[PDB]
């Protein structure tokens, strides 16, 4: 169970340097001892080795320069969780501190002087080319512009923002996973020995999926840090890249002045479920390293990330005790909805890509949609959509491009509810779509009702006083070898009951919160073309989204901001539960 991980993209691999990650409760004395054990063992086999850095604070482990011949030996070491081969990354009121991991910076530019502090942390790979020389270049450009976009006097988003610079990218805008890791551990160690003030970390870089980089980000996020990253400039799924793929970081895609996704030569902004939202990222005026009062127009998802870091810094100067869940929910709440032209993205990536462009704001129930990864084609394969630790799973739906689904279940897994979608016999696979909310003094629980084929007992509701129905899930309960017969719908009397087939188990989300008020809305078309829609009004938050009738006419259903969308085949109805506080 001690595994070896290398980058999927061969040209971005950096063999010779390896991150040895140890098990969770490994003390510094054990990491140092394990590092020395590797050196001694390697020397016994006649190999020089160099322990570049011993990790402590963010994760237990060490960084080692050695031959790949010694891998099988290092995987046999005690306490090892996994070994990851290093790879390259590339460039893409209260006082809040914004950490910037990027290039060097012109700290004396008028746009950012007095607001930027150069930390002296420096960790970059050597530049490519035997005769490469910076000469009159100060390797300032990317970093200076981004510090300006975050907090520049005249062209910045959060003009009143403190910033701290760490050099993790060289003159060619290239860094390593190992160097970024060390920069994140620096930030953590600063947090421990310094204040209890809000921290924003801007990671305007991207590399191939990295198990260790994503873990390091997850650890800083759980310690209360707000990480904002570029989605990537590869016109590709951001789940294949890191830190983009890490679910705890806030991944930002780039859009232009005509609300189009940004094009960068033959590539452009990344897309898909791992992108939290989009922001301005084309022709962005910001500080230029050319002179202390110069400006310059740049484009990319790092520009887009800097806008969100600015917005976060503004939000945190106002409410400094705001949690990361609260901030992500607020970022999504205030963004412009359904303004992006989704034509530019691959057709099968549009549903999964959010239609949100960031914006500043001008108690309350906030919900966001969380899409799962696609399940496999196995008939018993499942997809899982998870909420953030602080959030409630208020509803769970599913969707298949073929419509071959068994339904879905809101079930406990590791003490927390998850939205599990089940594939059907002969199905290509399915998606699970969670609706994750922040509800004040909520006491929620899911109640499972059984298949109801008798003439009574069909009505499923939150029969408990003070508990209100926020969402329904339906799971088909007839065996694949049993005689199939057309599903029969459970009748409708009361309006605030689950909708579903008599042959299915129903999972009801019942919440008890002080001023929680929840209602059902419907809208059906007889022979719909592609879809049916129903939306919560201004002041209401979509909590649940279900479809009617079953598989025969429907591919699935999913929330899209406050609109419940039901994807029909060639009387289809969209049933939505709209909820609100106080």
């Amino acid at each position: 169970t001690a595994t070896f991980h290398r980058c999927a993209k061969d040209p971005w691999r950096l063999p010779g340097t390896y991150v040895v990650v140890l098990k969770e409760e490994t003390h510094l004395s054990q990491s140092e001892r394990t590092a020395r054990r590797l050196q001694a063992q390697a020397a016994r086999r006649g190999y020089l080795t160099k322990i570049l850095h011993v990790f402590h604070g963010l994760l237990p482990g060490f960084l080692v320069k050695m031959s790949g011949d010694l891998l099988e030996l290092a995987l046999k070491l005690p306490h090892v969780d996994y070994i990851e081969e290093d790879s390259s990354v590339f460039a893409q009121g209260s006082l809040v501190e914004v950490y910037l991991l990027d290039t060097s910076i012109q700290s004396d530019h008028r746009e950012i002087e007095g607001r930027v502090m150069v930390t002296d942390f420096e960790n970059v790979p050597e530049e490519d080319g035997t005769r490469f020389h910076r000469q009159a270049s100060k390797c300032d450009s990317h970093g200076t512009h981004l510090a300006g976009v975050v907090s520049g006097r005249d062209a910045g988003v959060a003009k009143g923002a403190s910033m701290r610079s760490l050099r993790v990218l060289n003159c060619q805008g290239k860094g390593t996973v190992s160097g970024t890791l060390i920069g994140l551990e620096f930030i953590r160690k600063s947090q421990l020995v310094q204040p209890v003030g809000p921290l924003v970390v801007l990671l305007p870089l991207a590399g191939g999926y990295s198990r260790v980089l994503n873990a390091a980000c997850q650890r800083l996020a759980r310690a209360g840090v707000v990480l904002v990253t570029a989605a990537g400039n590869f016109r590709d799924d951001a789940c294949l890249y890191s830190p983009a793929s890490a679910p705890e970081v806030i991944t930002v895609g780039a859009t232009n002045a005509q609300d189009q996704p940004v094009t960068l030569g033959t590539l452009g902004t990344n897309f898909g479920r791992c992108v939290d939202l989009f922001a301005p990222g084309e022709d962005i005026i910001g500080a230029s390293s050319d002179c202390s009062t110069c400006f310059v127009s740049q484009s990319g998802t790092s520009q887009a990330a800097a806008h969100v870091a600015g917005i976060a810094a503004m939000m945190l100067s106002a409410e400094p005790e705001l949690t990361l869940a609260e901030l992500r929910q607020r970022l999504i709440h205030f963004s412009a909805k359904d303004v992006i032209n989704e034509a530019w993205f691959p057709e099968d990536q549009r549903v999964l890509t959010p239609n949100l462009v960031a914006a500043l704001p001008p108690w309350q129930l906030f919900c966001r949609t969380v899409w799962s990864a696609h399940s496999g084609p196995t008939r018993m394969a499942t997809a899982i959509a998870r909420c953030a630790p602080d959030e409630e799973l208020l509803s769970c739906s599913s969707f298949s491009r073929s419509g071959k689904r068994r339904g879905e279940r809101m079930e406990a897994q590791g003490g927390k509810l998850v939205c599990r979608a089940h594939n059907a016999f002969g199905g290509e696979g399915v998606y699970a779509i969670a609706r994750c909310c922040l509800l004040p003094q909520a006491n929620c629980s899911v109640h499972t009702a059984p298949p109801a084929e008798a003439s009574m007992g069909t009505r499923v509701h939150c029969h408990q006083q003070g508990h209100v129905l926020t969402g329904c899930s339906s799971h088909w309960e007839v065996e694949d070898l049993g005689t199939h017969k057309p599903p029969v719908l459970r009748p409708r009397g009361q309006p605030n009951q689950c909708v579903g087939h008599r042959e299915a188990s129903i999972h009801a989300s019942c919440c008890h919160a002080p001023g929680l008020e929840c209602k059902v809305k419907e809208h059906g078309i007889p022979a719909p073309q592609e879809q049916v829609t129903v939306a919560c009004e201004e002041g209401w938050t979509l909590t649940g989204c279900s479809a009617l009738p079953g598989t025969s006419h429907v591919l699935g259903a999913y929330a899209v901001d406050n609109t419940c969308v039901v994807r029909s085949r060639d009387a289809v109805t969209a049933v939505a539960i709209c909820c609100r506080s106080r």
Partner: antibody
Framework: QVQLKQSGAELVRPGASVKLSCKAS????????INWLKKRPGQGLEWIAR????????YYNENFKDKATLTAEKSSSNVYMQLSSLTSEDSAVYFC?????????????????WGTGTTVTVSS | DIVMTQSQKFMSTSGGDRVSITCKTS??????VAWFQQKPGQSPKLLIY???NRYTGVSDRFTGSGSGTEFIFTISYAQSEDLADYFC?????????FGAGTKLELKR
């Protein structure tokens, strides 16, 4: 006259299977759900599964999904439960019970009639 | 899975005229709680359904109360004939869960 007659006590070798039965009378067999429950000496009753005899469709407790297999025989007017790969943890008294609904709510019902139980001893 | 935590023994009141057991749930089951009587070698007998409604034929000496997560079952003027095991069960969510049972003891 509404009643459930269960099959007699069983002895079975570890790794073997049993088919317990529950004979229904005095009411329309196909119209009511029938359930199976496990009772060990010091423990509280465990719900195993349920079946609608009208359609033979089952619904199980995930913990017994592999062990138990429910079935209905409209002619015989009785429901069956087969337990497979038995062990000493399955030595218990098994009861069958009928659900009677009085309303449209999924909580407008109760277990009105029960069988007397079938003792299952798993031993070499 | 909802957890039923039943009283270990019956607690007396009014000089042994009222005897009671409590049954507490891990989550809110509203009023979806029923109480049974089981005499050794006999099938459970439904007594109270929906937390406080008495099944047909059940004596008015048997009563049930409560809502949410605490439910009480009481026997007024307990007789020798009432010596049996008593158990609760929730039907708010599947899998259905039952209390351990409590044997009635009487003084003489």
């Amino acid at each position: 006259q509404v009643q459930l007659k269960q099959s007699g006590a069983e002895l079975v070798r570890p790794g073997a299977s049993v088919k317990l039965s529950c004979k229904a009378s005095g009411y329309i067999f196909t119209d009511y759900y029938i359930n199976w429950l496990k009772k060990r000496p010091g423990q509280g009753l465990e719900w195993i599964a349920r079946i609608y005899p009208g359609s033979g469709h089952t619904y199980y407790n995930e913990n017994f999904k592999d062990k138990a297999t429910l079935t209905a025989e409209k002619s015989s007017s009785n429901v069956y439960m087969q337990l497979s790969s038995l062990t000493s943890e399955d030595s218990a008294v098994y009861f069958c019970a009928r659900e009677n609904f009085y309303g449209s709510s999924y909580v407008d019902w109760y277990f009105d009639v029960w069988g007397t139980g079938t003792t299952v001893t798993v031993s070499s | 899975d909802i957890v039923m935590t039943q009283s270990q023994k019956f607690m007396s009141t009014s000089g042994g005229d009222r005897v009671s057991i409590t049954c507490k749930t891990s989550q809110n089951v509203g009023t979806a709680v029923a109480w049974f009587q089981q005499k050794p070698g006999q099938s459970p007998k439904l007594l109270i359904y929906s937390a406080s409604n008495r099944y047909t034929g059940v004596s008015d000496r048997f009563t049930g109360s409560g809502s949410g997560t605490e439910f009480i079952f009481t026997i007024s003027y307990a007789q020798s004939e009432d010596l049996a095991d008593y158990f609760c069960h929730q039907y708010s969510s599947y899998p259905l869960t039952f209390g351990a049972g409590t044997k009635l003891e009487l003084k003489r």
